[PDB]
Amino acid sequence: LSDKLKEAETRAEFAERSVTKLEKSIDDLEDELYAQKLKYKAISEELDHALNDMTSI
Amino acid sequence: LSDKLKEAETRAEFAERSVTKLEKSIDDLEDELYAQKLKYKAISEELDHALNDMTSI
Amino acid sequence: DEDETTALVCDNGSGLVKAGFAGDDAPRAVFPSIVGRPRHQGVMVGMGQKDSYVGDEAQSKRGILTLKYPIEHGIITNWDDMEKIWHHTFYNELRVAPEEHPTLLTEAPLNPKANREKMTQIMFETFNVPAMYVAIQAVLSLYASGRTTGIVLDSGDGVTHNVPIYEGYALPHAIMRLDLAGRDLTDYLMKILTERGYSFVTTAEREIVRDIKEKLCYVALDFENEMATAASSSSLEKSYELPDGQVITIGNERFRCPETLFQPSFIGMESAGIHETTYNSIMKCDIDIRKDLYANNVMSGGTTMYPGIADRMQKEITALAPSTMKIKIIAPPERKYSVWIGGSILASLSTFQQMWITKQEYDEAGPSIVHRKCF
Amino acid sequence: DEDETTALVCDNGSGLVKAGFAGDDAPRAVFPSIVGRPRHQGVMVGMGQKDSYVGDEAQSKRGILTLKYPIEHGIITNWDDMEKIWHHTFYNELRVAPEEHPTLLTEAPLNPKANREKMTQIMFETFNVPAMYVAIQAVLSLYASGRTTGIVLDSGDGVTHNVPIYEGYALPHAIMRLDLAGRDLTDYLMKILTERGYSFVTTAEREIVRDIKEKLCYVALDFENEMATAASSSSLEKSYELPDGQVITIGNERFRCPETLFQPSFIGMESAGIHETTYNSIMKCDIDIRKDLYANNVMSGGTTMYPGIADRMQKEITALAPSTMKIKIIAPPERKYSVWIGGSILASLSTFQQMWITKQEYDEAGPSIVHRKCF
Amino acid sequence: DEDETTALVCDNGSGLVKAGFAGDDAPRAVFPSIVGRPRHQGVMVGMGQKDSYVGDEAQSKRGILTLKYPIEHGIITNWDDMEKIWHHTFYNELRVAPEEHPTLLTEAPLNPKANREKMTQIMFETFNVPAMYVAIQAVLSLYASGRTTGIVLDSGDGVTHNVPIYEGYALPHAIMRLDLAGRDLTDYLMKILTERGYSFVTTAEREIVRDIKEKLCYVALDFENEMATAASSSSLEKSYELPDGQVITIGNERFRCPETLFQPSFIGMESAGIHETTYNSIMKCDIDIRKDLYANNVMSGGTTMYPGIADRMQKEITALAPSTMKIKIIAPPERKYSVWIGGSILASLSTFQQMWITKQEYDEAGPSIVHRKCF
C-alpha cells in the first residue's frame, strides 16, 4: 500500500500534472480557439463585409 | 495507507477524468479550431480566389 | 446507376482524367492520371497493401509510392495502368460500366495514330464497350466554346496543339504542334525553386511543385515590368505551405515559370512562344479566313487559367497582326475542363450517332479501324 | 497454462526476458536476463548449491553470486546463457516444451545479423522447435500500440534504434541507431551517487543502483528549472532504503540520470539524445510520410516509465518539428511490454502462419536461413 | 610566397578542398572541409588548446573533437567556418594573401543562388580580394579533359549534377540534378557494417568508414554475379585496419555500397541511378547533339575512382542508348583533380580576364553580382 500509494500518488500527481499540462493546453486551446475565432471570423467575416463594399461598383 | 491510497487512487482516477475531460475538450476545441481555421481559410481563399478572378472588374 | 445508355465521355490526358456522361455540362469527377507503386519493403504482416494504387488512392498513399502517369504528352503508352484508371473512373466514380454504354475518348489532331488505336483496342477488348469514338480535342474545344471558326489553343499539361478550324473544316497545313506544356512548367518551377534554396527532385516534391504552380502562378500582361518589381521587392512575393509544414516564399519564379509559354527558351525549347504559333497558324490561312480566325483565338486546357494569359497573348498577336482588323481571345470560365464538355456535346449530337465504331466492325477489322471510322 | 499448440513468444534484451503464449495480452513469465555464479568457497556440505543460477534464482541467491547478462547493446554474446534462460522460462515457469510449439523471437532491423542467427539456432537445435521466426521490434511495438504507422523509439536497456515505419513498410535509410540505453543511465547514476558518498561497484551494489533508478528517477519537464530547485532544497530528495536497512537520499541526481537521454554527453557520447534521433529518423523520411509519423511518434520498451518523459519528449520534438502539423507522442500502457504484446499479436495472426521457418528448411540450410526468411 | 599575382584556385566541396595557384597543374593545399571542436572538459592547464581546429588540425586532434563539415550537398551552410578553412588554406598552407590574388571558387549549375553570392561576399568583405569568380565545375572538367563537349558527371561527396555542355554552351534543360553522392555511400556503408557487428556512428567512426570506402569499395561490371560469390566465400573479402590496431573484414558490402549509384533505392532514394541520369542528360539534348555527348561522357570529381566505374558506366549507358552509336567514357588518371586543373586553366586564360568581377563592381552591385557576371 505504501507503494500502491506512491504509485497512486504518482498517478494522482501524474493526473495533477497531466491535468496541469492540460489545464495549460485547455487554456491554450481556449485562447487559441478564441484567438483563431477572434481573428478568423472577425477578419474573414470582415473580409465578407468588405465584400459587401469590395464588390460594389 | 488504505485511506491515503483510496484518496490517491480516487484523486488519481478523478483527476484522470479531469485529464480526459480537459483532453477531450482540447480535442473538441481543436476540432472547432480546425473548423474555424477551415472556414477562415475557405473564406479568405474564396475571396482571394474570387478576387483574383475579379481583380479585373 | 444511369437510366439510359448515354455515352460515357472521358479526357484521359498526361495531367488529369476528366469524366462524366454525355448530356451533362461538366465532368462528374476529375482526378490525376496516376497509378502508384510502393518503393519500400513491407515489414508488418496483415496490412493489406496493394501492388498498385489508382488516382486519388495513388496520391493518398504517396508517402511510400513512386507515381507514374501512363499518358506521355498526349499519348498512351502504359495501357495497363490506364486500364486501371478507366476501371476506377467508370466503376468507383461514375458508377457506370462501359459494357452498357458507348464510349468517347479524345486526342489532338496531330497525335500519333497509335494512341487512337490502343484506346480503341482496350475499351473493346477489356471493357467490352458496345461502341467507340475517338474525338478530336480541337473539335471538342470549339464545341464547348461555341465556335465553328477559330484557333484552338489547348495549352494543357501534355502538348499545345494550335489548330485553325474554319466553318467546321480543318486547315491542317497551318497546325503548329508545339512541345511546350503545363508538364514542363512543373519541372521548370522545380529547378527555379532549387535556385531559391528549396530543391525539388522526387515524386512527392513534383506533386508539391504542381500544387505551388496551380495555386501561386500567373503570367502577367507585361513580363519585364512584373519581373523588375518581383525581383526588387517582397511586395510581389507569395508564400506556400508544404504538406510537411515547411514554408516556401516565391518571388519572380511565380511568373518566370509560366512566362516560358511566351519564352520557351527558358526550358531550352526552340520556339517563339504560344502567341507566335497562334499568329502563324492564322497567317498561313487564306485572307478570307484570317479575318475570322484573328477575332476568334479560343482557349482550352490548363495554363489558360493564368492571370494575364488571354491579355498577354492577345497583345502579342495584335502587335504581330495588321491594323484595322480586330484580334480577340475567347477565354471562357469553362476553362481546363471545356474539352470534356465538348465531348458531351459531340457524344449527344444526333448527327454523331452514325460515327460510332460498333463492337462488330471492331472485331472484324481490329483496332486499326479507328483510323478509318473516326476521322 | 495452455490448451493449444500456439506459438510461443519471447522478447530478449540486456535487461529482462518476457515470455508467454501467443494470443494473450501479457507474458506469463518475466525473468531478468541473468545467469549467476558463486564466487566463494563452500565449507558446509549437504547444502545443495548450484553451479549456476538463472533468472529469479540468480537474483534470490545473489548475495554470494556474480551476476552476468548474455545480451550487449542489442546482441547475444553468450548463447549458452540464453539457452539456460529460455530453458528455465519455458520448461519451469511456463511449463511448455517448445518442441510442440512454433517460437517467435525479436530484434530491431539494424541489429547485427549474428543475433538473428543465434536466436534461430538455439531454438532449433537445443529446444527442437518445429518452427521459427524473428520479428522486428518496431513491428511488434506498432502492433501493441494499435498503429501501422509511427516511429518506434525503443529506449530499452541495451540500445535505442528509433525505427520509422509507414503503412507497415520499413524506411531503413532513416534508422538512427543510438548508443544510449538504460544500462548506461545506471552507470551514470553509480558515478553521481559516488560523488554523494555512496560507492556502488560490486554485483549487489550494481543491482541496487539499477533498482534505485527504476523506482526513484524521472526525466524533468524542465531540466534547468527542476535542478535549480532540486539543487537548492532537500524537499525534492527521495529516500531509498538499501537492502541492509541503511538509506540513501537522492536529489537532483534523481533526474540527472535520465537527463542523459537528453544529454548523452553525460556518459561521454557524441549525441544530443533520444529526442534528437526521434527527430532525425523522421527528418529523413519522405516529405509525404512525415505528417503521419509526427502525429504518431511512439514510445516503446522501458525508460519510458519516467513520469517526466511523457511531457519532456513531446516538448523536445515539438520544438524541432514543423508548424501547422499536429505533433504528438504516443505513450501507451503497453510500454515496457509492447514488444512481447506485439509478438503475441503477430504470432497469432492467420496471415503470419505462412511466415515460419520450418524445422526442415532450417536443417537443410542452417541458421543463416533466418537472413533470407524473416526480413 | 608566390612570384606572381595569379588567381588562386579553390575547389571547396562538402568533402575536401583542393586549393592552389592558377597556371599550375595541381593543387598545393589539400584539406578536408572540416572544422573541429573539443567535446570534453579540460583537467590540465597551460595545454594550449584551440576553440576550433581546421583542416588537418581538425583531423590530427580529432580523438576528442566533434568534426563538422561547413558545406553540405553542394552549398555552404556555415560561412564563418568556411572563413576559418580559407584563412588557413590561404595564409598558412598556400602562404598567400587573397588581397593580391583574385581567387576562383567552384559551383554546380543549379546550385542555389545564395551560395554563389555568399562566397562572393566573404572573399570581398573578409579577405579583401581584388576580384572574384565562381566557376562551373563542368566547365572546368571539360577544360582539364581537352573538350568543349560532353556530359560532366561530377559524382562527388555532395551532389551528382549530371550536366551536359556542347561547343562550350550550357544545355541547362537537360541537367539532371541527383540527390545521391559520396556522403550517402559512406552512410550506407556504416549501416551495413553495423549488420556485420561493427557499428559506426561517432566522428572517429564516421571518418574511418569514409576511409574504408575509399580504400576497399568497387563497382565492377556485374553486381549480381559479384554478390553471388562475395556472399558465398571469403575469397572476395578484404580486411581494413582500424586506428587502434583492430581490424574489420568486409565482404559484399564492399560493392553493395557504391552499387547504390546504380541502385539508389539502397538509401531510400527515388532514382534509377547515375547511368539513367547520364543517359537523360544526353537524350534530353537535341538529336544532332546526342551523338557528341554519347561519345564524350566525362568522369569528374570523386567516386570516379571506384574500380570498374568508367567501364561500368559505359556499359550501363550503352544498354540504354540506341545501337550503332558509340558511347565513350573519358576517364583519365587526372580523375577528380580535373576540376582543380580546369580552374587553373580558366582563371589564367587571357580570354577570361574580363570575366573577373572587380572590387568596384562588387560594392556598387553587392554579392548578387556573381549571378550576372560569371555566366
CB of D290 within 8 Å of a chain C CB? The answer is yes
Spatial separation of the C-alpha atoms in residues E254 and A45, rounded to whole Å? 65
Residue for grid cell 474554319: C166
Chain D interface mutation, best of A17, A22, A25, highest count of D Cβ atoms under 10 Å: A17
Residue for grid cell 575536401: E16
Nearest to C126 by CA among C70, C72, C81, C71: C81
Residue A44 has its nearest CB partner, among B26, B29, B43, at: B43
DSSP letter string over C107-128? Answer: E-TTS-HHHHHHHHHHHHHTS-
Q: Between vectors from CA E306 to CA E304 and to CA E310, what angle results, nearest 5°? A: 55
E370 to chain C, closest Cα gap in Å: 14
Helix axes C137-145, C338-347, angle to 10 degrees: 90
Spatial separation of the C-alpha atoms in residues D31 and D36, rounded to whole Å? 13
Q: Whole-angstrom distance between the N-terminal and C-terminal Cα of chain E?
A: 32
DSSP character for E88?
I
Query: Quick check: do C and D touch, 3+ CB pairs under 8 A?
Result: yes
SS3 assignment, position E323: coil
Bridge pairing between strands E297-299 and E150-153: parallel
Cβ burial C299-323 (10 Å sphere, 16+ → b, else e): bbbbbbbbbbbbbbbbbbbbebbee
What backbone torsions phi and psi does residue C156 show, to the nearest 5 degrees? -90, -160
Bridge pairing between strands D103-107 and D238-241: unpaired
Helix axes E79-87, E113-125, angle to 10 degrees: 50
Q: Give the distance from CA D35 to its chain's centroid.
A: 17
Task: Give yes or no for a contact between D96 and D90, defined as CB atoms under 8 angstroms apart.
Answer: yes
Helix (H) or strand (E) holding C152: strand C150-153
Q: Quick one: fold of D35-68?
A: Actin; Chain A, domain 2 (2.30.36)
B44 to chain C, closest Cα gap in Å: 14
Residue for grid cell 455540362: C25
Q: HSE (CB half, 13 Å, CA atoms) of C287? A: 2
Q: Between vectors from CA A17 to CA A15 and to CA A18, what angle results, nearest 5°? A: 60
CA distances from C162 to C137, C217, D117, D304, E153 (A): 11, 23, 66, 65, 39
Spatial separation of the C-alpha atoms in residues D234 and D231, rounded to whole Å? 8
Residues of B in contact with A45 (CB under 8 A): 43
Spatial separation of the C-alpha atoms in residues E227 and C248, rounded to whole Å? 44
Chain C interface mutation, best of E176, E270, E280, highest count of C Cβ atoms under 10 Å: E270
Question: Cα-Cα-Cα-Cα dihedral of D141, D142, D146, D147, to 10°?
Answer: 160
Chain D interface mutation, best of E37, E189, E193, E202, highest count of D Cβ atoms under 10 Å: E202
Chain D interface mutation, best of C39, C41, C43, C62, highest count of D Cβ atoms under 10 Å: C43
SS3 assignment, position E134: strand
Residues of D in contact with C62 (CB under 8 A): 288
The superfamily in CATH containing domain D182-267 is: ATPase, substrate binding domain, subdomain 4 (3.90.640.10)
Taking domain D136-181+271-332, whether its CATH number is 3.40.50.740 is answered by no
**Solved with:** cryo-EM
Task: Give yes or no for a contact between C193 and C206, defined as CB atoms under 8 angstroms apart.
Answer: no
Nearest to E140 by CA among E104, E183, E89, E98: E104
Chain C interface mutation, best of D171, D287, D345, D353, highest count of C Cβ atoms under 10 Å: D287
Nearest to D105 by CA among D279, D351, D346: D346
Nearest to C217 by CA among C262, C252, C268: C252
Spatial separation of the C-alpha atoms in residues E258 and E182, rounded to whole Å? 8
Nearest to C266 by CA among C219, C211, C204: C219
Task: Give yes or no for a contact between E5 and E98, defined as CB atoms under 8 angstroms apart.
Answer: no
Nearest to E324 by CA among E365, E351, E291: E291
Task: Give yes or no for a contact between E17 and E30, defined as CB atoms under 8 angstroms apart.
Answer: yes
Residues of D in contact with A14 (CB under 8 A): 307
- Is E114 close to C197, i.e. CB distance below 8 A? yes
Helix (H) or strand (E) holding E72: strand E71-72
Task: Give yes or no for a contact between C42 and C148, defined as CB atoms under 8 angstroms apart.
Answer: no
Q: Could you give the maximum distance between any two Cα atoms of chain A, in Å?
A: 79
**Class of domain D4-34+71-134+337-371 as given by CATH:** alpha beta
- Is D270 close to E203, i.e. CB distance below 8 A? yes
Question: Cα-Cα-Cα-Cα dihedral of D274, D276, D277, D283, to 10°?
Answer: 150
Task: Give yes or no for a contact between D127 and D96, defined as CB atoms under 8 angstroms apart.
Answer: no
Q: Which residues contact C245 (CB under 8 A, 6 or more apart)?
A: D291, D321, D322, D323, D324, D325
Cell numbers describing residue E29: 593545399
Helix (H) or strand (E) holding E132: strand E131-136
Which stretches within E217-252 are classed as H helix?
A: 223-230
Task: Give yes or no for a contact between C151 and C178, defined as CB atoms under 8 angstroms apart.
Answer: no
Query: Quick check: do E and D touch, 3+ CB pairs under 8 A?
Result: yes
Question: Could you tell me how many residues make up chain B?
Answer: 57
Q: For E267, name the nearest residue in chain C, comparing CA atoms only.
A: C40
Task: Give yes or no for a contact between C347 and C9, defined as CB atoms under 8 angstroms apart.
Answer: yes
E4 to chain C, closest Cα gap in Å: 36
Q: How many CB pairs below 8 A link C and E?
A: 33
Would the CA dihedral through D195, D197, D202, D203 be positive or negative?
A: negative
Task: Give yes or no for a contact between E130 and E6, defined as CB atoms under 8 angstroms apart.
Answer: no
Spatial separation of the C-alpha atoms in residues D177 and E191, rounded to whole Å? 9
DSSP character for E260?
G
Neighbours of C1 (CB within 10 A): 6
Task: Give yes or no for a contact between D20 and D94, defined as CB atoms under 8 angstroms apart.
Answer: yes
Neighbours of B13 (CB within 10 A): 15
Spatial separation of the C-alpha atoms in residues E264 and E38, rounded to whole Å? 35
Spatial separation of the C-alpha atoms in residues E118 and E124, rounded to whole Å? 10
Spatial separation of the C-alpha atoms in residues D123 and D12, rounded to whole Å? 13
Spatial separation of the C-alpha atoms in residues C296 and C280, rounded to whole Å? 14
Question: Does the fold of domain E136-181+271-332 match that of domain E4-34+71-134+337-371?
Answer: yes
CB of B55 within 8 Å of a chain C CB? The answer is yes
Nearest to E271 by CA among C54, C66, D175: C66
Q: For B27, name the nearest residue in chain A, comparing CA atoms only.
A: A29
Bridge pairing between strands D75-76 and D71-72: antiparallel
Cβ burial A21-54 (10 Å sphere, 16+ → b, else e): bbeebbeebeebbeebbeebeeebeebbeebeee
One-letter amino acid at C65 equals: L
CB of B52 within 8 Å of a chain C CB? The answer is yes
Residues of D in contact with C245 (CB under 8 A): 291, 321-325
Spatial separation of the C-alpha atoms in residues E14 and E33, rounded to whole Å? 7
The secondary structure of chain D, three-state, reads CCCCCCCEEEEECCCEEEEEECCCCCCCEEEECCEEEECCCCCCCCCCCCCCEECHHHHHCHHHEEEECCEECCEECCHHHHHHHHHHHHHHHCCCCHHHCCEEEEECCCCCCHHHHHHHHHHHHCCCCCEEEEEEHHHHHHHHHCCCCEEEEECCCCCECCEEEECCEECHHHCCCECCCHHHHHHHHHHHHHHCCCCCCCHHHHHHHHHHHHHHCCCCCCHHHHHHHHCCCHHHCEEEECCCCCEEEECCHHHHCHHHHCCHHHHCCCCCCHHHHHHHHHHCCCCCCHHHHHCCEEEECCCCCCCCHHHHHHHHHHCCCCCCCCCCEECCCCCCCHHHHHHHHHHCCHHHCCCCEECCHHHHHCHHHHHHHCC
Query: Quick check: do E and A touch, 3+ CB pairs under 8 A?
Result: no
Spatial separation of the C-alpha atoms in residues E177 and E185, rounded to whole Å? 17
Residues of C in contact with E268 (CB under 8 A): 40
DSSP character for E74?
T
Q: For B56, name the nearest residue in chain A, comparing CA atoms only.
A: A55
- Is C46 close to D289, i.e. CB distance below 8 A? no
Residues of E in contact with C252 (CB under 8 A): none
DSSP letter string over C336-375? Answer: SSHHHHHHHHHHT-GGGTTSPEETTHHHHH-GGGHHHH--
Residues of E in contact with D178 (CB under 8 A): 201
SS3 assignment, position E222: coil
Spatial separation of the C-alpha atoms in residues D154 and D175, rounded to whole Å? 12
A15 to chain D, closest Cα gap in Å: 10
Residue for grid cell 475542363: C337
Residues of C in contact with B56 (CB under 8 A): 307
CB of C191 within 8 Å of a chain E CB? The answer is yes
Nearest to C254 by CA among C314, C205, C202, C209: C209
Q: Whole-angstrom distance between the N-terminal and C-terminal Cα of chain B?
A: 79
CB of C239 within 8 Å of a chain D CB? The answer is no
Nearest to C135 by CA among C165, C159, C104, C114: C104
Residue for grid cell 466514380: C93
CB of D311 within 8 Å of a chain A CB? The answer is yes
Q: For A14, name the nearest residue in chain D, comparing CA atoms only.
A: D307
C268 burial class (0-12, 13-18, 19+ CB within 10 angstroms)? middle
- Is D179 close to E197, i.e. CB distance below 8 A? no
Task: Give yes or no for a contact between D162 and D271, defined as CB atoms under 8 angstroms apart.
Answer: no
Give partners of A (≥3 CB pairs < 8 A). B, D
Cβ burial E341-363 (10 Å sphere, 16+ → b, else e): bbbbbbbbeeeeeebbbebeebe
Name the resolution in angstroms. 7.8
Q: Which residues contact C232 (CB under 8 A, 6 or more apart)?
A: none
Cell numbers describing residue C8: 460515357
Spatial separation of the C-alpha atoms in residues C264 and C274, rounded to whole Å? 9
Residue C241 has its nearest CB partner, among D165, D285, D324, at: D324
CA distances from D250 to C186, D168, D240 (A): 62, 43, 8
Spatial separation of the C-alpha atoms in residues E102 and E21, rounded to whole Å? 10
CB of C307 within 8 Å of a chain B CB? The answer is yes
E364 burial class (0-12, 13-18, 19+ CB within 10 angstroms)? exposed
SS3 assignment, position E298: strand
Q: HSE (CB half, 13 Å, CA atoms) of D191? A: 10
Bridge partners of C241, per DSSP, are C247
Helix axes D338-347, D137-145, angle to 10 degrees: 90
Give partners of D (≥3 CB pairs < 8 A). A, C, E
Spatial separation of the C-alpha atoms in residues D342 and D312, rounded to whole Å? 26
All structural domains of chain E with their residue ranges: 4-34+71-134+337-371, 35-68, 136-181+271-332, 182-267
Radius of gyration of chain E (CA): 21
Spatial separation of the C-alpha atoms in residues C263 and C253, rounded to whole Å? 14
A5 to chain D, closest Cα gap in Å: 13
